[PDB]
Amino acid sequence: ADVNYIVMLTCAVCLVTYMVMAAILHKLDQLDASRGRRFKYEILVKTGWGRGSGTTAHVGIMLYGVDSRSGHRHLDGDRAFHRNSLDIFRIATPHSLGSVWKIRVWHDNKGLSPAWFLQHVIVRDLQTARSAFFLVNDWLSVETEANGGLLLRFRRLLVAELQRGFFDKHIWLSIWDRPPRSRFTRIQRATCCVLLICLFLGANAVWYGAVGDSAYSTGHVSRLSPLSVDTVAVGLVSSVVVYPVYLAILFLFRMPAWCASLAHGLSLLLVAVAVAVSGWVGASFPPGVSVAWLLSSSASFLASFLGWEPLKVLLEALYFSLVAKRLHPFLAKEEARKVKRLHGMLRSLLVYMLFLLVTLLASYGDASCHGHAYRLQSAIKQELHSRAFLAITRSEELWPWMAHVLLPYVHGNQSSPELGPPRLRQVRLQEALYPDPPGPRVHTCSAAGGFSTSDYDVGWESPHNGSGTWAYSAPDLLGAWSWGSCAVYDSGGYVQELGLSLEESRDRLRFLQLHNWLDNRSRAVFLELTRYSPAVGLHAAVTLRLEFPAAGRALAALSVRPFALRRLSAGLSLPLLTSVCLLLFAVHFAVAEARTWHREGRWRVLRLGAWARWLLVALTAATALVRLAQLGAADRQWTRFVRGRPRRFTSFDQVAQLSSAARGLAASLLFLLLVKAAQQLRFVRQWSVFGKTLCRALPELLGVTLGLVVLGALRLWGALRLGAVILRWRYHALRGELY
Amino acid sequence: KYLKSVLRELVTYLLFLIVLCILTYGMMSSNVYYYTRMMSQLFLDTPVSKTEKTNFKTLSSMEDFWKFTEGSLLDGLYWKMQNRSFIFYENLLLGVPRIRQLRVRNGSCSIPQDLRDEIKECYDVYSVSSEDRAPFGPRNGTAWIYTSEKDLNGSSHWGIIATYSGAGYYLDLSRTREETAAQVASLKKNVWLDRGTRATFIDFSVYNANINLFCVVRLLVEFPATGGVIPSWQFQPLKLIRYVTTFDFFLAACEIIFCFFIFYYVVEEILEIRIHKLHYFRSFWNCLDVVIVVLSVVAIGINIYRTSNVEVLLQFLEDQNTFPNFEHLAYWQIQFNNIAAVTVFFVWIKLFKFINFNRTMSQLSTTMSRCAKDLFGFAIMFFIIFLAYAQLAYLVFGTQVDDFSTFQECIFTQFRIILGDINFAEIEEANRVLGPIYFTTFVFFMFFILLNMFAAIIADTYSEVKSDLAQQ
């Protein structure tokens, strides 16, 4: 009944991005439909090429070329290319070629056959010189067409059809470039794309784990790394086996009375089924396979984008060309600006969704051991009698404490599997202090002397032939740094191993305790041990600090840090995968901001957008690097421990520190992303008031709060009301201006 | 032009506030309030004896009061050594406590004709015209001598239930437990006080050698003629031995500098009065300057009085068998609090003067002129309802609630209810009906009406000021 969050998060992100994309595309399609009712040059249109050609014919103009697409003209007016009349060619060509061959025209005899010779409407150079300035001098006839440089060949027909269909038949990057007079509506493009994504997800989910009994292709060898025979093969076969149920609905969308209306319902039903089956099978994925699933899905998507669509467009062009042998393939500037803005936000939405998915994988990918860690730490503190251990305040009950409740715990028949003998430490500082005047303690810490860098013998200093048996045990590189109340301690100090057996522990305790080694000065003692648990696969770094600020009274505290030890050399674990693409996103953001810094020049300071885009970069870089540091430290500590297992300690506390720092950073980044998502809500017309009212209200509000706090931490503002007063006035005024 | 008068004055006020803050930084400890609260709370912890445990509030009947009197009633200050008597080696046996009691005489009125043979000990309220100096008992020692208060180096009483005059008798303790215990036992053998005592005050002076600062403890007891006694106790950190190190010299220099600055300001004001607009009070803003001048004068007078008391107190410590007389310089903590308040007011004035540099972040917070008084009309109508609820609660409750025992703290209980601290564990069984009704009708009328109108009264003022600024 264990739940895997990876597939749930992926499907949720896909569905949300589909919903937002459809919401944008509906408005864009409404705008296009309103439109569907400069590269060229607006040179003199004194054209009188229509002489003795009495008919109300129509003229079709096609601005051919690279990134060029234009619709046909019309005959609108009192004359409107009437009997023995002419016309002036001046329309709004949305796209036309540059300094290249851009000419394609046709005349449809909408009535009688026009008997004239229309050469050209010469547009030499007015806006961008989309073509040259010459003439064709072609006699008009019934269905007369002429094209070429600035009929039935099967040599350039194929290239023309490929050109007009290279970015319209390619379903992936066709939502940006729907040509007018098309019944595909640009909104079922999104439905088709999300259908393909969800079918990819479902196929790759049901393939992994759920089904295999043929040759044990899935099983013990779960090597998620790409071996070219384990990951890409599944993606390619999944991409191939989905087209038989994809091309049918794609065909039914195109071309016929009313089935297309319920085609959307059918598509959503099949998408819902594909999501449901993946969600139901997600329970039985071990963590090592859930990443291979994602990699296979990513490979499958890239296959249908880099070779499955090009062959589609080529074969459809060949079908349309070889057989059926067909031949036919003020506000205006603001509308173009609106279209460009819509395109920009649409292309930013995908990047934002991908980044949100990445950070969700980084943060909540392993969010199933979060409860277990809480239960483990609660179990550990309650067993050690934490409230009883904190209650002691003298330096003599410590011994009966750790002689009746600690030794049975650490040493027992089963006694909570340990993975490592405990240690005892000390610091004495060699600048021994004196008792303070009676009364309350000096809670600021005093007697800051040198540091212990000397060796002593049993009892205290008495070297005879050799060096001190109680060496300082010089600190490592990683260290610990507990940040104690009196001072921030280091890992250096004289250490004892507390024996290995239960009776040995008691014997060592008594024998070493009758010598009074930590009774006079004793800056701190510390007591730390490890508590690996196999049931949930979690470790626990447990430490018990006890501080002596004043010779007599002792301060004590404890902390239990549970974590999940995962080594970097384990392979391609999920944190490793999600912490390297975060670096890629950070580099992308940094280069995108640098491409704007020099583009605008200088004086880009005192701008929040110029600073909010650097805090994000720093946070992403820190999150990426801290996880790698944690993995490296964990691997180093584990190999050091295995090297000297029966006699070493290895102090796993550094890994616990890093595993908490990384989790904090990953949560902060997600919080910032959620705040940005909240900010992106202003696009609704009636809901844009709140954010901008807040924007105009914050400066003076912060100023007056600072003024009040300077005058005084008593509750004056939120005590009864003041902020509502300003907010009401600003909101009322701004909403009055809006209406 | 038009900028020096708003910059130089602001800078001078800020500098004065900084100097005052520096002076007050080494004036009193940050735990002064906590220390005062602890001293006030632990002033009524006197046991009875080894037989009974009748405390001060548990000894009102015969045997309870007898047990309270016989025991450690006078053994608190004197403790056996591990002569001298130091509880924690901080306040040694250097001096003795003092006790002052004021009494009145009966028979100062005529009983009614009907109750002529029934009412004989009919005594009215004590007053200045009801002072007597008649001693009772056998004259054996000097403890029954009559003396005044002016010649005994004393002062008035200023009690709670009775502000009696300086007449009465005084008693002094010893420097050791051996004689004090014998004296207490001898005094307790027979009667020691009468029922005509009006005000009683016990004053104790302690050296407190751990930290060089005089300590004074005052316990007041007053019995009126209408029945009932109001007991109280307090402590004050008297300043008479503050000369220890260079910090005292720095404080004296700061006081001298403040006095010189006040004199310079007064001279400037005088030079800008007789040759300028004088006897003018229709400004509604110069009252702040007048209050600042009054506060400076009050601080100067407090410093002068403290210096005079210190000079007068320099004649003590002549012998090693007497007590330190600190009954004339017990206004040090109050003076320090007043000085801190004056420094805060000076900082506020400097901030108000210098906030004019703000474009629009401080112009909306300057609405005193638009709201000249304009607000006491709400404070009065709030306090009337508050006092009405306090009276109602003190009458209906006050016998089985353990909280609403007296008015001054019923006010505090209602304040804590407003703040959020609600008990509601004793009101319900004190009175099942009219108990919950009080609580509900109080919370409804406080949290929904008055506290909700005090927001509107300043909301409309802000809107009006903003409208004026926009139209101008």
Coordinates of N, CA, C and O in Angstrom, one line a residue, chain A residues 479-582:
Chain A
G479 N 34.7 17.9 11.0 CA 34.4 18.4 12.3 C 32.9 18.3 12.6 O 32.2 17.4 12.1
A480 N 32.4 19.0 13.6 CA 31.0 19.0 14.0 C 30.5 20.4 14.3 O 29.4 20.8 13.7
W481 N 31.1 21.1 15.2 CA 30.7 22.4 15.7 C 29.3 22.5 16.2 O 28.4 22.9 15.6
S482 N 29.1 22.1 17.5 CA 27.8 22.0 18.1 C 27.2 23.4 18.6 O 26.1 23.4 18.9
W483 N 28.0 24.4 18.5 CA 27.6 25.8 18.9 C 27.0 25.8 20.2 O 25.8 26.1 20.4
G484 N 27.7 25.4 21.3 CA 27.3 25.4 22.6 C 27.0 26.8 23.2 O 27.4 27.8 22.6
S485 N 26.3 26.8 24.4 CA 25.9 28.0 25.0 C 27.1 28.9 25.4 O 27.1 30.1 25.1
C486 N 28.0 28.3 26.1 CA 29.2 29.1 26.6 C 30.1 29.4 25.4 O 30.4 30.6 25.2
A487 N 30.4 28.5 24.5 CA 31.3 28.7 23.4 C 31.0 27.6 22.3 O 30.4 26.6 22.6
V488 N 31.4 27.9 21.1 CA 31.3 26.9 20.0 C 32.4 25.9 20.1 O 33.6 26.3 19.8
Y489 N 32.1 24.7 20.5 CA 33.1 23.7 20.6 C 33.5 23.0 19.3 O 32.8 23.1 18.3
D490 N 34.7 22.4 19.3 CA 35.2 21.7 18.1 C 35.2 20.2 18.5 O 34.8 19.8 19.6
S491 N 35.7 19.4 17.6 CA 35.7 17.9 17.8 C 37.0 17.5 18.5 O 37.0 16.3 19.0
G492 N 38.0 18.3 18.7 CA 39.2 17.9 19.5 C 38.9 17.7 20.9 O 38.0 18.3 21.5
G493 N 39.6 16.8 21.6 CA 39.5 16.5 23.0 C 39.9 15.1 23.3 O 40.0 14.2 22.4
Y494 N 40.1 14.8 24.6 CA 40.6 13.5 25.0 C 39.4 12.6 25.0 O 38.3 12.9 25.4
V495 N 39.6 11.4 24.4 CA 38.4 10.5 24.1 C 38.6 9.1 24.8 O 39.7 8.7 25.0
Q496 N 37.5 8.5 25.2 CA 37.5 7.2 25.7 C 36.4 6.4 25.0 O 35.4 6.9 24.6
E497 N 36.7 5.1 24.8 CA 35.9 4.2 24.0 C 34.8 3.5 24.7 O 34.0 2.8 24.1
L498 N 34.8 3.6 26.1 CA 33.7 3.1 26.9 C 33.6 1.6 26.8 O 32.5 1.0 27.0
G499 N 34.7 1.0 26.4 CA 34.7 -0.5 26.4 C 33.9 -1.1 25.2 O 33.5 -0.3 24.3
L500 N 33.8 -2.4 25.2 CA 33.1 -3.1 24.1 C 32.0 -4.0 24.7 O 31.1 -4.3 23.9
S501 N 32.2 -4.5 25.9 CA 31.2 -5.4 26.5 C 30.5 -4.8 27.7 O 31.0 -3.8 28.2
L502 N 29.4 -5.4 28.1 CA 28.6 -4.8 29.1 C 29.3 -4.8 30.5 O 29.3 -3.8 31.1
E503 N 29.9 -5.9 30.9 CA 30.7 -5.9 32.1 C 32.0 -5.1 31.9 O 32.5 -4.5 32.9
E504 N 32.6 -5.1 30.7 CA 33.8 -4.3 30.4 C 33.4 -2.8 30.6 O 34.2 -2.0 31.1
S505 N 32.2 -2.4 30.2 CA 31.8 -1.0 30.3 C 31.7 -0.6 31.8 O 32.3 0.4 32.1
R506 N 31.1 -1.4 32.6 CA 31.0 -1.1 34.0 C 32.4 -1.1 34.7 O 32.7 -0.2 35.5
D507 N 33.3 -2.0 34.3 CA 34.6 -2.1 34.9 C 35.4 -0.8 34.5 O 36.1 -0.2 35.3
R508 N 35.4 -0.5 33.2 CA 36.1 0.8 32.8 C 35.5 2.0 33.4 O 36.2 2.9 33.9
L509 N 34.2 2.1 33.6 CA 33.5 3.2 34.2 C 34.0 3.4 35.6 O 34.5 4.5 36.0
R510 N 34.0 2.3 36.4 CA 34.5 2.4 37.8 C 35.9 2.7 37.9 O 36.3 3.7 38.6
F511 N 36.8 2.0 37.2 CA 38.2 2.2 37.3 C 38.6 3.6 36.8 O 39.5 4.2 37.5
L512 N 38.1 4.1 35.7 CA 38.4 5.4 35.3 C 37.7 6.5 36.1 O 38.2 7.6 36.2
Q513 N 36.6 6.2 36.8 CA 35.9 7.1 37.6 C 36.5 7.4 39.0 O 36.4 8.4 39.5
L514 N 37.3 6.4 39.5 CA 38.0 6.6 40.7 C 39.2 7.4 40.6 O 39.9 7.6 41.6
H515 N 39.5 8.0 39.4 CA 40.7 8.8 39.2 C 40.3 10.3 39.0 O 41.3 11.1 39.0
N516 N 39.1 10.7 38.8 CA 38.6 12.1 38.8 C 39.3 12.8 37.7 O 40.0 13.8 37.8
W517 N 39.0 12.4 36.4 CA 39.6 13.0 35.3 C 38.8 14.2 34.8 O 39.4 15.1 34.2
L518 N 37.5 14.1 34.9 CA 36.7 15.3 34.6 C 35.8 15.6 35.8 O 34.6 15.3 35.8
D519 N 36.4 16.3 36.8 CA 35.7 16.8 37.9 C 36.0 18.2 38.4 O 35.2 18.8 39.0
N520 N 37.2 18.7 38.0 CA 37.7 20.0 38.5 C 37.3 21.1 37.5 O 36.6 22.0 37.8
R521 N 37.9 21.0 36.3 CA 37.7 22.1 35.3 C 36.6 21.7 34.3 O 35.5 22.4 34.3
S522 N 36.8 20.7 33.5 CA 35.8 20.1 32.7 C 34.9 21.1 31.9 O 33.7 21.2 32.3
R523 N 35.5 21.7 30.9 CA 34.7 22.7 30.1 C 33.4 22.0 29.6 O 32.3 22.6 29.7
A524 N 33.6 20.9 28.9 CA 32.5 20.1 28.4 C 32.9 18.7 28.2 O 34.1 18.3 28.3
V525 N 31.9 17.8 28.1 CA 32.1 16.4 28.0 C 31.7 15.8 26.7 O 32.4 15.1 26.0
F526 N 30.4 16.0 26.3 CA 29.8 15.5 25.1 C 29.7 14.0 25.1 O 30.5 13.3 25.7
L527 N 28.6 13.4 24.5 CA 28.4 12.0 24.4 C 27.5 11.7 23.2 O 26.3 12.1 23.2
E528 N 28.1 11.1 22.2 CA 27.4 10.9 20.9 C 27.5 9.4 20.5 O 28.5 8.8 20.8
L529 N 26.5 9.0 19.7 CA 26.4 7.6 19.3 C 25.5 7.5 18.1 O 24.7 8.4 17.9
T530 N 25.6 6.4 17.4 CA 24.7 6.2 16.2 C 23.7 5.2 16.4 O 23.8 4.2 17.2
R531 N 22.5 5.3 15.7 CA 21.3 4.5 15.9 C 20.7 4.1 14.6 O 19.5 4.4 14.3
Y532 N 21.5 3.4 13.8 CA 20.9 2.9 12.5 C 19.7 2.0 12.7 O 19.7 1.2 13.6
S533 N 18.6 2.2 11.9 CA 17.4 1.4 12.0 C 17.1 0.8 10.6 O 17.0 1.5 9.6
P534 N 17.0 -0.6 10.5 CA 16.9 -1.2 9.2 C 15.4 -1.3 8.7 O 15.2 -1.4 7.5
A535 N 14.5 -1.1 9.6 CA 13.1 -1.3 9.2 C 12.7 -0.2 8.2 O 12.0 -0.4 7.2
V536 N 13.1 1.1 8.4 CA 12.7 2.2 7.6 C 13.9 2.7 6.8 O 13.8 3.6 6.0
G537 N 15.1 2.1 7.0 CA 16.3 2.5 6.2 C 16.8 3.9 6.6 O 17.1 4.7 5.7
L538 N 16.7 4.2 7.9 CA 17.1 5.5 8.4 C 18.2 5.4 9.4 O 18.2 4.4 10.2
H539 N 19.1 6.4 9.5 CA 20.1 6.5 10.5 C 19.7 7.6 11.5 O 18.7 8.3 11.2
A540 N 20.4 7.7 12.6 CA 20.2 8.7 13.6 C 21.5 9.1 14.2 O 22.1 8.2 14.8
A541 N 21.8 10.4 14.2 CA 23.0 10.9 14.9 C 22.5 11.5 16.2 O 21.8 12.5 16.3
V542 N 22.9 10.8 17.3 CA 22.4 11.2 18.7 C 23.7 11.7 19.4 O 24.7 11.1 19.4
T543 N 23.5 12.9 20.0 CA 24.6 13.5 20.8 C 24.0 14.0 22.1 O 22.8 14.5 22.1
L544 N 24.8 14.0 23.2 CA 24.4 14.5 24.5 C 25.5 15.4 25.0 O 26.6 14.9 25.4
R545 N 25.2 16.7 25.0 CA 26.2 17.7 25.5 C 25.9 18.0 26.9 O 24.8 18.1 27.4
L546 N 27.0 18.3 27.7 CA 26.9 18.7 29.1 C 28.0 19.7 29.3 O 29.2 19.4 29.2
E547 N 27.6 20.9 29.7 CA 28.4 22.1 29.8 C 28.6 22.5 31.2 O 27.7 22.5 32.0
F548 N 29.9 22.8 31.6 CA 30.2 23.3 32.9 C 30.8 24.8 32.7 O 32.0 24.9 32.5
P549 N 29.9 25.8 32.9 CA 30.3 27.2 32.8 C 31.0 27.6 34.0 O 32.0 28.2 34.0
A550 N 30.4 27.3 35.2 CA 30.9 27.6 36.5 C 31.2 26.4 37.3 O 30.3 25.5 37.4
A551 N 32.4 26.3 37.8 CA 32.9 25.1 38.5 C 31.9 24.8 39.7 O 32.0 25.3 40.8
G552 N 30.9 23.9 39.4 CA 29.9 23.5 40.3 C 28.6 23.2 39.7 O 28.1 22.0 39.7
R553 N 28.0 24.2 39.0 CA 26.8 24.0 38.2 C 27.1 23.6 36.8 O 27.9 24.2 36.2
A554 N 26.4 22.6 36.3 CA 26.6 22.1 34.9 C 25.3 22.2 34.1 O 24.2 21.9 34.5
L555 N 25.5 22.7 32.9 CA 24.4 22.8 31.9 C 24.4 21.7 30.9 O 25.5 21.3 30.5
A556 N 23.2 21.1 30.7 CA 23.1 19.9 29.8 C 22.1 20.1 28.7 O 21.1 20.9 28.9
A557 N 22.3 19.5 27.6 CA 21.3 19.5 26.5 C 21.6 18.3 25.6 O 22.6 17.6 25.7
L558 N 20.6 18.0 24.7 CA 20.7 16.9 23.8 C 20.0 17.2 22.5 O 19.2 18.2 22.4
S559 N 20.3 16.4 21.4 CA 19.7 16.6 20.1 C 19.9 15.3 19.4 O 20.9 14.7 19.4
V560 N 18.8 14.9 18.6 CA 18.8 13.7 17.9 C 18.5 14.1 16.4 O 17.4 14.5 16.1
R561 N 19.4 13.8 15.5 CA 19.2 14.2 14.1 C 19.1 12.9 13.3 O 20.1 12.2 13.0
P562 N 17.9 12.6 12.8 CA 17.7 11.4 11.9 C 17.9 11.8 10.4 O 17.5 12.9 10.0
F563 N 18.5 10.9 9.7 CA 18.8 11.2 8.3 C 18.8 9.9 7.5 O 18.6 8.8 8.1
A564 N 18.9 10.0 6.2 CA 19.0 8.8 5.3 C 20.3 8.8 4.6 O 20.6 9.6 3.7
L565 N 21.2 7.9 5.0 CA 22.5 7.8 4.4 C 22.5 7.2 3.0 O 22.1 6.1 2.8
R566 N 22.8 8.1 2.0 CA 22.8 7.7 0.6 C 24.1 8.2 0.0 O 24.4 9.4 0.1
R567 N 24.9 7.2 -0.4 CA 26.3 7.6 -0.9 C 26.2 8.1 -2.4 O 25.3 7.7 -3.1
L568 N 27.2 8.9 -2.7 CA 27.3 9.4 -4.1 C 27.6 8.3 -5.1 O 27.0 8.2 -6.2
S569 N 28.4 7.4 -4.7 CA 28.8 6.2 -5.5 C 27.8 5.2 -5.7 O 28.0 4.1 -6.3
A570 N 26.6 5.4 -5.1 CA 25.5 4.4 -5.3 C 25.0 4.3 -6.7 O 24.3 3.3 -7.0
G571 N 25.3 5.3 -7.5 CA 24.9 5.2 -8.9 C 24.3 6.5 -9.4 O 25.0 7.6 -9.4
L572 N 23.1 6.5 -9.8 CA 22.4 7.7 -10.3 C 21.1 7.9 -9.5 O 20.0 8.1 -10.1
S573 N 21.2 8.0 -8.2 CA 20.1 8.2 -7.3 C 19.4 9.5 -7.7 O 19.9 10.4 -8.3
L574 N 18.1 9.5 -7.3 CA 17.2 10.7 -7.6 C 17.8 12.0 -7.1 O 17.8 13.0 -7.9
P575 N 18.4 12.2 -5.9 CA 19.0 13.5 -5.6 C 20.1 13.9 -6.5 O 20.3 15.0 -6.8
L576 N 20.9 12.9 -7.0 CA 22.0 13.2 -7.9 C 21.5 13.7 -9.2 O 22.0 14.7 -9.8
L577 N 20.4 13.1 -9.7 CA 19.8 13.5 -11.0 C 19.2 14.9 -10.9 O 19.3 15.7 -11.7
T578 N 18.5 15.1 -9.8 CA 17.7 16.4 -9.6 C 18.6 17.5 -9.1 O 18.2 18.7 -9.2
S579 N 19.9 17.2 -8.7 CA 20.8 18.3 -8.2 C 21.8 18.7 -9.3 O 22.6 19.5 -9.0
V580 N 21.8 18.1 -10.5 CA 22.6 18.5 -11.6 C 21.9 19.3 -12.6 O 22.5 20.2 -13.2
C581 N 20.6 19.0 -12.8 CA 19.8 19.8 -13.7 C 19.4 21.2 -13.1 O 19.2 22.1 -13.8
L582 N 19.4 21.2 -11.7 CA 19.3 22.5 -11.0 C 20.4 23.4 -11.3 O 20.3 24.6 -11.5

